[PDB]
């Protein structure tokens, strides 16, 4: 039962994460249909609140205009 | 379910709960007879073992009434379509058989013709299950039922952002916050006629829960009526 | 004519040579009156319990 973050909610079935709006976007032609299943088919997952893309890099759900940080390791 | 009410005792007896290896309910089922449960093809795609609990009312508590039936075999419809939930129907035959009792009785299958003419033309039906109580809410620990008006087809078709094949039908509200939701799939949609409940649909899929301008969509059982029979021959 | 009131049939109403003919779900059997259904069992499908 993962502990969600400011701006993500808890999907006690998970089936909803697959459909999160992703920051550097470009949407599928058809959303993962798993998202329309009314079954509780997966484990709880924090997924974005409506109106919050997930910044690909900083694992988070921000407003749209905030999708932008560059990573490198050492 | 999203807003309706708990089924009082005796109220939703054909209700079945499919449960995972951890005893967590993940779908429903309608009790058709002592050895048979009607569910949605798609609740069973993950593949791992699961059981069947008839008789439950509160899930945070065991307290007599319940009973877990081991599935002896499952018959997924063979033209199902993950991509679009077409033919989202499947029967389960229990190893051991259900002991009808208070809170545990089956629902009747209607006669196609009579169903299409007299049943599906009733104003509503009754969806029911242990599903989360809000689109982004949690699973309900208590069994809930909801009366949902039949929605007309094109009306259904044009409101959905996805295909409404004739193996499926629409039910709910345009705007009212009442609908079935995650955790509810494979549950019963039974239409009542003079104090008798006939299985008329299975809880299939749907865009969100209670979303304005959207209905919940159900498997049109009245079109797998013969399918359901042959399905109960399995020898 | 079934369409007046399901031909006053409690369950499946139908028409045979311009005569409504009632019928029932498995578990039931048609009362003599040809309209109703008598559960030929303790847990006929469709009736709730508390009863
Ligand atoms: Na709605």
Domain ranges of chain C: 1-51
What's the A49 CA to ligand 1 centre distance in angstroms? 19
Q: Is A47 on the interface with B (CB under 8 A)?
A: no
CB–CB of B74/B92 below 8 Å? Answer: yes
- Name the experimental technique: X-ray
Question: Resolution of the experimental model in angstroms, please?
Answer: 3.1
Q: B120-154: buried (b, 16+ CB within 10 Å) or exposed (e) per residue?
A: beeeebbbbbbbbbbbbbbbbebbbbbbbbbbeee
So where are chain A's domains?
A: 1-74
Q: What is the third-level CATH fold of C1-51? A: Laminin (2.10.25)
Residue B235, C-beta contacts closer than 8 angstroms, at least 6 positions apart: none
Q: Do chains C and A touch (3 or more CB pairs under 8 A)?
A: no
Q: Is B181 on the interface with A (CB under 8 A)?
A: yes
* 3-class state of residue B7 by DSSP: coil
**Does the CA dihedral B40-B45-B46-B52 come out positive or negative?**
positive
Q: Provide the CATH number for the domain formed by A1-74 in this structure.
A: 2.10.25.10
CA distances from B141 to A11, B57, B63, B226, C30 (A): 16, 8, 14, 34, 40
Q: Which domains does chain B have, with CATH numbers?
A: 1-12+107-222 (2.40.10.10), 13-106+223-235 (2.40.10.10)
B26, B162, B203 member nearest A36 (Cβ):
B162
- Check if B195 is active-site: no
Identify the bridge partners of residue B188 per DSSP, sorted by sequence position: B202
Which burial class, exposed, middle or buried, applies to C23 when counting CB atoms under 10 A from its CB (0-12, 13-18, 19+)?
middle
Residue B185: which of B124, B103, B128 has the closest Cα? B128
């Amino acid at each position: 039962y993962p502990e969600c973050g400011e701006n993500e909610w808890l999907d006690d079935c998970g089936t909803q994460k697959p459909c999160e709006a992703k920051c550097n976007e470009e949407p599928p032609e058809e959303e993962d249909p798993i998202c329309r299943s009314r079954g509780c088919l997966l484990p709880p997952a924090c997924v974005c609140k409506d109106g919050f893309y997930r910044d690909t890099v900083i694992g988070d759900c921000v407003r749209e205009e905030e999708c932008d940080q560059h990573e490198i390791i050492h | 379910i999203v807003g309706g009410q708990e089924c009082k005792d005796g109220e939703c007896p054909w209700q079945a709960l499919l449960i995972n290896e951890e005893n967590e309910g993940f779908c429903g089922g309608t009790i058709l007879s002592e050895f048979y449960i009607l569910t949605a093809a798609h609740c069973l795609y993950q593949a791992k073992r699961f059981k069947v609990r008839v008789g439950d009312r509160n899930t945070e508590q065991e307290e007599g009434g319940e009973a877990v039936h081991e599935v002896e075999v499952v018959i997924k419809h063979n033209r199902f379509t993950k991509e679009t939930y077409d033919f989202d129907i499947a029967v389960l035959r229990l190893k051991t058989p259900i002991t009808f009792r208070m809170n545990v009785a089956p629902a009747c299958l209607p006669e196609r013709d009579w169903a299409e003419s007299t049943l599906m033309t009733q104003k509503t039906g009754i969806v029911s299950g242990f599903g989360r109580t809000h689109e982004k809410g949690r699973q309900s620990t208590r069994l809930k039922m909801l009366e949902v008006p039949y929605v007309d087809r094109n009306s259904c078709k044009l409101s959905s952002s996805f295909i409404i094949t004739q193996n499926m039908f629409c039910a709910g509200y345009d705007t009212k916050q009442e609908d079935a939701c995650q955790g509810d799939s494979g549950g019963p949609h039974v239409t009542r006629f003079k104090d008798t409940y006939f299985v008329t649909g299975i809880v299939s899929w749907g865009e969100g829960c209670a979303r304005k301008g959207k209905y919940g969509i159900y498997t049109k059982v009245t079109a797998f009526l013969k399918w359901i029979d042959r399905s109960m021959k399995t020898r | 004519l079934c369409s007046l009131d399901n031909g006053d049939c409690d369950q499946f109403c139908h028409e045979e040579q311009n005569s409504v003919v009632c019928s029932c779900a498995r578990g039931y059997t048609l009362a003599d009156n040809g309209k109703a259904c008598i559960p030929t069992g303790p847990y006929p499908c469709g009736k709730q319990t508390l009863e």
